[PDB]
Design a protein around this nucleic acid. Structure first.
Lengths: 65, 262, 262, 65, 66, 67, 66, 67, 67, 66, 65, 65, 67, 67
RNA sequence: AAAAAUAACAACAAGAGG
RNA sequence: AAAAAUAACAACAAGAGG
């Protein structure tokens, strides 16, 4: 797969990313953990976003696998 | 409780509509203020007893050339004032505005050029739209509620027209025309008296004179009752009778919770 | 006809006002929604049966430090929703906002920093004023009518503070502060529920703790019920009784011609 | 399931007042009574069920865990 | 699971509910039946509403499931 | 599928004019010719294949019910 | 799968000019050249791929038999 | 998943400036690094990660043929 | 005022609908019935007296000329 | 004063309910009990003394003709 | 002249608290201690001379005469 | 006096003057007539403007006496 | 004139500082140095000439007596 | 006119730039050509006629004495 | 077509209309 | 805290909140 290595690479070295939801609402923060269904991002509060409502996940700094 | 019925029918000539049964119909409706747009008659023509409904006071603002405009108003109660014209040329000398000042609210009646004859009509239509936008920008500082019983000849949304993809280029659904209603109803706070109670579709008010459009209900919604925001919650029943119409337009019967006083 | 009564009183601590008989007073006023500002207690303190008025549901939004804020609300009917906070932290962690969502209206209750202690409270007050202006700019697109029972700690006009030439430099009558109420009531179109009915002078809601200000009536008006424009005409009468008092502030009592539903 | 279930249960038994966002931008707020694989029921004044396919984001008001 | 017992308690007690869809449009009625996928309610006529398009099901009266 | 399929079959056989409200609020009125477990076909002037995952409600015009 | 697959195939091999409506209301129009379980390849000046979970309806221009 | 992976793989081998439209009408240009069962990467100044359940359409700016 | 009253008398006998601007900005649109040295009665729907020290300007709707 | 005085005497002797609009816009409802060259005595509760130089218009509620 | 001079004298002799509403809406409440033409002296903690051409209304607080 | 020759010279020259009223309302147009109490101005329609409501009269061009 | 001029003369020769109010609400402060039938000279750091038809009230700072 | 016109002639002879505040509360700066008992002329770039019943106050920019 | 009334902006080069 | 419902924007690089 691709999602499980990419999100692990994104969370282990803590890139400040922006997640765009399906309605256009954008969310700044860093990913701490992720299961098969949700993603827990935390800038100042432990926030949980369901992955079925995520349009895009964009890192701010360039990342490689 | 208290009630107030307002009818804002566009007649396309009060003589040609009165020959078809307008004045025998308006008497049996129990309206407080009837607003007649595009009356196509001078002030002397409405002074005859053929148009004088019993129980109603008749006030009219005619054009200089009486075929180009004209606006009439019947009122149950006698108003505190009657003011004709808006202050600029396309509203004044064409007779496209009349106002009946009552106790707390004032009921206005407004006619617009259709823009369907030629390009000069569309140009004076855009002139009227900009000048009336400047008028509405000034009238929001006052402490009086307004009811503009207008025949705007401009449709607002995709719901107000039938088959909107084919209607993008005809005058009445233009993008600067619908952006003007997005400015009046959206940002200036003004309300639509028909949209506050029924968001049901297929409620049209204007039809072309071809029978194929009216048997298939290819209609338009051109005439509105624009409300100042203080009136938003006073609307009970706004309907457009499709069947007993007397012109290309349909009447607009709106029932309010207001109690009209002198 | 239909009626609603809203009582908004800044208590300066609900314990010190309940020892002065506030809860014995509020029961005999037949209010629908009572809004309590700067209640100075946590959420556990209002869970005791000492504050539970019979017939009323009590909802509270406390601060993390309970001496620095707090907001309470009693309601006759149970609301559809109860929302604490409005998005920015100077009311969120200080507990200066609560909202009771009912059927077609939401009644909100709002506390402000007075800016009377020091300059940091005045800068916090300007931050709150700018953030609440940005909130009121966003809330103009909704179809729900609001009543904000606001302990605003600003006097709007020369009529609203006793001798205004000596009052120009105190927090409560500053020029950026009165310009904010000129922008809220003027250009954003919001009503003041007192000035929709009574525009006589010598109505004030707050006095200093000095008895010379009490007896000369050296008062200020710092309390408002602020209405979305569709409510301008739903205001029968509004009053500010001087005599029964429980705080530096008098109760603001307003009657509405409106029928509160679930 | 390895992240979603220890998170909603921690917000449930501690009774943190959370704010649940929907996919159409509507902000609901209350306390979580329980949760299935598919639903979360919250109480503000009236207990109501919300399907998880309509939930975009679950935000607690105070930091948890 | 409380997907099925809560809807069974709303169905058997005949509780007038309000169903908010995923676009804000509410539907008031009484849940007549439901399977895994649909919910049939009747205010005026019988109506089938898909579970993937609802957002909230709220009752008018306070009901806790057994 | 144990309860929606005899409902849609009753909508077919009695030929009642139905109205399908989509998940964005758009009403498509007509009558159901045939339905799969993934799609429904409605006929007003042409045969539309509407997907079942884009439908909010299916409501008939007159009240009918299954035996 | 038992009825949408003959319908898309008889829109394909008769090359009927179809109008396909997305779930956000976007009206695309072209021709169906291929379809798997998951996508439909709309053929026009550019040949694009449309996911089936974003499609509300597929209408034909002329009424076809099935 | 029978035919979509040759299409995206044809876009991946010979790299096309592909425009992907989202379900809310958002247009995104870029080039596909790789794709998965559920997600697609895009190359720009920032490297986007977009899930397939939010993608409405995938179009190339250049007319590409499918073998 | 030898020139004030060929004007108001002409607007009276020809019955031109006039507009009287007051000194506080209030526009009273009406029709002159009679006038003193000090007051003017206008008739819109009900006849009212207007003191001339409160009148700022008096305009007619259509152009008129003096005898 | 060919119409100043007879109009006010007709409003006074008929004791009509009248409305005086001042030069700043203030509306005073009452009844004319007496008037001099300079003043007008409006009256509803506690009477008044209204100076003529601040009066803009005087509107009777009933139609009054000389 | 003939009617304001018996009125202001009646206001002065019984010493009723009058309220003088000026042209610009500003009211001055007090007592009338003396008057002739063109002025009225309003009595308070300090005594002020109000010009009569800047007065809209003079209304007493008690019904008299 | 001074008003009569000034208004006569301003009338016979036909200067497009601007009259500012006491409330700040600006009026444009040349002067047709004046007697003692009132002034008839004209740009499009003959406007009758009372002198006790006029603050200033401003010529557009410089005017010599 | 029988009571206005002794009041202004008393406010003049005792040099009482006055807060004089205009009809548009403007409070000027100074002290009265001279007055005719029509104007009043208000001495301060500049010597003005206020018109009596623009004055609403004349308020002294301290209570003074009248003969 | 026992004391006003000496003050105005003192303003006229020395050609001091004065400021006239009107009853609208607005100011007008400049010198004075001439005056009468009804109007006052002002010298800015434009030559104004200002009615004396609309003038509230007249002030000099710097103090002039009155003999 | 007019706030039953701002104990009072040391002062809007001027809201073709408060 | 939510329009008993826009027969349908060849498409808003994206309203920390419709």
């Amino acid at each position: 797969s691709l999602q499980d290595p990419y999100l692990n690479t994104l969370r282990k070295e803590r890139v400040p990313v922006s997640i765009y939801l399906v309605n256009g609402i954008k969310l700044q923060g860093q990913i701490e953990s992720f299961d098969q269904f949700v993603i827990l991002l935390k800038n100042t509060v432990s926030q949980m976003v369901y992955k079925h409502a995520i349009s895009t996940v964009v890192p701010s700094r360039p990342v490689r696998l | 409780g208290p009630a107030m019925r307002i009818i804002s029918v566009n007649v396309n000539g009060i003589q040609a509509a009165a020959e078809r049964g307008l004045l025998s119909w308006l008497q049996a409706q129990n309206a407080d203020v009837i607003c007649l747009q595009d009356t196509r008659a001078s002030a002397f023509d409405l002074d005859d007893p053929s148009f004088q409904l019993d129980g109603y006071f008749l006030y009219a603002c005619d054009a200089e050339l009486p075929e180009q405009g004209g606006v009439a108003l019947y009122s149950r109660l006698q108003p505190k004032a009657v003011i004709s014209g808006l202050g600029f040329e396309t509203a004044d000398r064409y007779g496209r505005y009349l106002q009946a000042d009552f106790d707390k609210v004032s009921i206005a009646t407004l006619l617009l050029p259709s823009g369907q004859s030629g390009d000069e009509s569309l140009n004076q239509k855009f002139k009227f739209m900009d000048d009336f936008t400047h008028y509405l920008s000034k009238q929001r500082r006052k402490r009086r509620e307004y009811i503009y019983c207008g025949s705007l000849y401009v449709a607002h949304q995709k719901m107000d027209v039938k088959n909107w993809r084919e209607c993008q280029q005809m005058p009445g659904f233009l993008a600067p025309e619908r952006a003007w209603l997005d400015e009046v109803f959206g940002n200036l706070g003004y309300a639509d008296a028909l949209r506050e109670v029924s968001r049901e579709g297929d409620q049209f008010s204007w039809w072309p004179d071809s029978e194929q459009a009216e048997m298939l209900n290819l209609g338009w919604r051109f005439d509105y009752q624009v409300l100042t925001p203080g009136l938003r919650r006073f609307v009970r029943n706004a309907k457009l009778p499709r069947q007993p119409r007397f012109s290309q337009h349909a009447p607009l019967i709106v029932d309010y919770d207001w109690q009209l006083s002198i």
